């Protein structure tokens, strides 16, 4: 039925809107029965999704695209199928397939949403994989590898080793200070400063990191800053270390005044 099945659909939409999902679903099926058009299936999938039956929704939709292809259905509507699969997978917390099905939807028909939803799901995946990468024992293994390359003056490999440590333990200030040490040896000073800064936000009480920052600042003739960094360094050294690296601070203080 032309106008006949469109009423069943419309009746579904009325029930769907009042959150009566099984009632919506049955009218969507009636619509399909009367007139083979995949819109009605996309709509049933919406009802299934809203019920929280995410597997049923994906099932309904996978079938919808297969039947839509056989029927040569409009590229937009099958793009919605793929898009809803993406949503359903995202509700299932399966980030791979949500991304895969967003790609599939954009391939069929590029829209603004879905492009935004893809970038958000990709963002969310990056964050997750990063949080999975974190490993205590792999971090300690990297810290040991770094010291080995550092003792053998292999700065480029030490940098890599210490980057693995930063990735394996993003909260350990030693990784940044250590990469900062190797970077300085390679005379990449602005980078050495930046790693020292992140080391100091990770551990405000980490003296060695203040000393590297200042040393690298002196090396790039940033004298005003070097003296400030050295003050901060001396304050935290009194508090934390009983001023046990004061002679080292002083030498750098003297060079930064000269």
């Amino acid at each position: 039925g032309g106008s006949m099945a469109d009423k069943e659909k419309a009746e579904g939409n009325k029930f769907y809107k009042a959150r009566q999902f099984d009632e919506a679903i049955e009218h969507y099926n009636k619509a399909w029965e009367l007139h083979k058009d995949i819109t009605y299936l996309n709509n049933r999938a919406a009802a299934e999704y809203e019920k929280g039956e995410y597997e049923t929704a994906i099932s309904t939709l996978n079938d919808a695209v297969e039947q839509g292809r056989e029927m040569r259905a409009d590229y937009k509507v099958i793009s919605k199928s793929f898009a809803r699969i993406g949503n359903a997978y995202h509700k299932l917390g399966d980030l791979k397939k949500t991304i895969e099905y967003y790609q599939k939807s954009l391939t069929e028909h590029r829209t603004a949403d879905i492009l935004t939803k893809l970038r958000n799901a990709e963002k969310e995946l990056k964050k997750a994989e990063a949080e999975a990468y974190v490993n205590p024992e792999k971090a300690e293994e990297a810290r040991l590898e770094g010291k080995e390359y550092f003792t053998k003056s292999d700065w480029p490999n030490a940098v890599k080793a210490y980057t693995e440590m930063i990735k394996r333990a993003p909260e350990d200030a030693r990784g940044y200070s250590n990469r900062a040490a190797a970077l300085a040896k390679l005379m990449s000073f602005p980078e050495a400063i930046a790693d020292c800064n992140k080391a100091i936000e990770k551990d405000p009480n980490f003296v060695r990191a203040y000393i590297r920052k200042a040393t690298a600042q002196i090396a790039v003739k940033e004298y005003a800053s070097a003296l400030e960094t050295l003050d901060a360094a001396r304050t935290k050294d009194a508090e934390v270390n009983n001023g046990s690296s004061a002679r080292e601070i002083d030498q750098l203080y003297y060079k930064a005044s000269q």
Binding site: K9, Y16, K17, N42, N43, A46, E50, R84, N87
Partner: peptide, 5 residues
């Protein structure tokens, strides 16, 4: 809610 057509 998801869009119905």
């Amino acid at each position: 809610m998801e869009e119905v057509d």
